[PDB]
Amino acid sequence: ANPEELGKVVTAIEQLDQMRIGLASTLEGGTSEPTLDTFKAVCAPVGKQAKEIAAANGWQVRQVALKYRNPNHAPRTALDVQALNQFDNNHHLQAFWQTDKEGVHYFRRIDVQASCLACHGAKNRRPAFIQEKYPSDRAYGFRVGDLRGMYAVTIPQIQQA
Numbered sequence: 001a002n003p004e005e006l007g008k009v010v011t012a013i014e015q016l017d018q019m020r021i022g023l024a025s026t027l028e029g030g031t032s033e034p035t036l037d038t039f040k041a042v043c044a045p046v047g048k049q050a051k052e053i054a055a056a057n058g059w060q061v062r063q064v065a066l067k068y069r070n071p072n073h074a075p076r077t078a079l080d081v082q083a084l085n086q087f088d089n090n091h092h093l094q095a096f097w098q099t100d101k102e103g104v105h106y107f108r109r110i111d112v113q114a115s116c117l118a119c120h121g122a123k124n125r126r127p128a129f130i131q132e133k134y135p136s137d138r139a140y141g142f143r144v145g146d147l148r149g150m151y152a153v154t155i156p157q158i159q160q161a
């Protein structure tokens with residue numbers, strides 16, 4: 001890893017975050033009843049873009065949450081749990097990077113805004129397709145200001161070129 005690369009990671013992640021926020025922005029939170037707008041793609045393109053960034057840069061990039069919708073986003077390592085804990089214990093902590101044998105790891109917290117409650121709010125108010133597409137879903141019951149999860153990036157110690 002080099003200076004430009006570290007900065008590129010911060011920027012890429014922040015752009016991914018602003019992208020999600022942008023897609024969700026058209027939706028209200030206080031709406032109880034079902035609406036067609038909830039069939040809008042909001043978070044799937046975030047995951048797709050994450051894969052694209054990972055592949056284009058030779059990084060690992062992944063969303064991680066204790067309460068996840070997609071099983072690919074579960075915590076996997078002691079570091080995942082440690083990072084989520086750091087975010088949980090310091091609400092002002094937005095992001096951090098850590099180095100170890102595996103390489104350089106950047107984590108950036110994801111918080112819950114009102115719009116998000118359209119699909120991650122009340123369990124009983126989740127849009128139809130969610131439950132059958134995600135049978136083991138846990139990404140509900142959030143309130144505005146909750147810790148949603150985090151982005152996790154690794155710049156591996158050993159590259160390919």
Ligand code: HEC
Nearest residue numbers: 024038042043044047063068069070073116118119139149
């Ligand atoms: C319905 C249109 C949703 C809106 C509004 C929000 N989210 Fe979402 N989220 C939704 C789906 C269908 C998924 C799974 C996508 C996939 O990769 O298969 C998600 C997932 C996330 C994740 C990834 C971690 C996980 O639980 O799998 C995060 C971090 C996340 N959602 C956060 C999030 C935020 C902050 C939102 C408000 C800006 C938000 N989501 C809105 C459906 C919908």
Ligand SMILES: [Cl-]
Nearest residue numbers: 041042043044
């Ligand atoms: Cl989505």
